[model samples]
Target: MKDGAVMVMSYGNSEEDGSGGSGGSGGSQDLYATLDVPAPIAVVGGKVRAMTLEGPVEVAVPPRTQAGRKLRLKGKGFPGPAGRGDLYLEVRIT
Candidate 1:
């Protein structure tokens, strides 16, 4: 998922049942989690480029943040996965 874009994960599997037994078909589910960048965004030429991050991100690091890092950038005018959309950055942790 790109920055500013929302990434949701489902918690249901085929190896479960709905009964109250070991094979009970029941599991938790996650709704559409919106991860928006409250900051303004920018654009460069045609491609989407996020501004350089200064320090750690403000939001709590989610499980997907295993990289232990996040990016910060303008979130106004940007590109989208298919076309032009919100603007965001990518965080890479060592």
Candidate 2:
């Protein structure tokens, strides 16, 4: 764990078949807690596309935004039972 970093962990239920037994197999879960993004703007209310673990993501800098501000991307997280997790982008204003 690094300082000033975010780590997200998502837990999913095991796969089950018709019977009440374990499914075939399983793999690592895809989830991210913190996303490091460059200073998207010199001022506030700027938007930019930054590449993340998931893929190219768009982030909009809110007005009066400051460092350590977090933005959430719905359904852009790891795969889970319900559906998928969410990805949060930590804002770093230059």
lDDT value for model 2: 0.44
Per-prediction TM-score: 0.20, 0.49
- Which candidate number has the best TM-score? 2
Query: At residue 74, what lDDT does model 1 achieve?
Result: 27
1-94: candidate 1 lDDT, tens digit per residue: 4554322211111265421111111221111112332122111111122231222323322233322122222232233332332223332332
Candidate 2 error regions (>4 Å) = 1-43, 80-83
Among residues 3 or more apart in sequence or in different chains, the pairs in candidate 2 whose N, CA or C atoms overlap within 3 Å are 8-33
lDDT of each: 0.25, 0.44
What is the lDDT for 11 in model 1? Answer: 14
C-alpha RMSD (angstroms) for model 2:
13.9
